[PDB]
Amino acid sequence: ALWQFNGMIKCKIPSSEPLLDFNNYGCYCGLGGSGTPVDDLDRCCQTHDNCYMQAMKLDSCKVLVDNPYTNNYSYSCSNNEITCSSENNACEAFICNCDRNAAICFSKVPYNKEHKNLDKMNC
């Protein structure tokens, strides 16, 4: 679920404000997105979007009920490292890995404030 993704991002990037910093950035960071990612961070968001799309089509995820935004899973944060729990069901495990991959990606790429609030003309 989103507030677990927020937690993951704080795990890797304690100085971030994840629902602020990684929303409305580039062509992909935020609800929706299409076109050409403008930088590596935006590409992390592209990847995450694609992962959430796959999660929504997984046989093991019930339509709507198991959606990635509201489907809570189990994870932990240890020394700024994320673990997805083996206690998760298959749908939850998939979603947890989407979020883990993105939080790690966000932590490994530069943040370019000039890419905030891009108009879709740029995509």
Q: Reduce the DSSP state of residue 79 to 3 states and report it.
A: coil
Residue 82: its H or E element: strand 81-84
Position 81 contacts Cl ion (CB under 5 A)? yes
Q: Give Cα 96 to chain centroid, integer Å.
A: 9
- 26 lies in the site for Ca ion, by CB under 5 A: no
The one of Cl ion, Ca ion, none whose footprint includes residue 28, by CB under 5 to 8 A per kind, is: Ca ion
Minimum distance between the CB of residue 15 and Cl ion, rounded to whole angstroms? 16
By CB under 5 A, residue 82 contacts Cl ion: yes
Using rule CB under 5 A, residue 87 touches Cl ion:
no
115: annotated active-site residue: no
Cβ distance 111 to 15 under 8 Å? no
Alpha helices in 13-118 (DSSP H): 18-21, 40-57, 90-107
Give the annotated binding-site residues for Ca(2+). 28, 30, 32, 49
Q: List residues binding Ca ion (CB under 5 A).
A: 28, 33, 49, 71-72
Active site positions, annotated: 48, 99
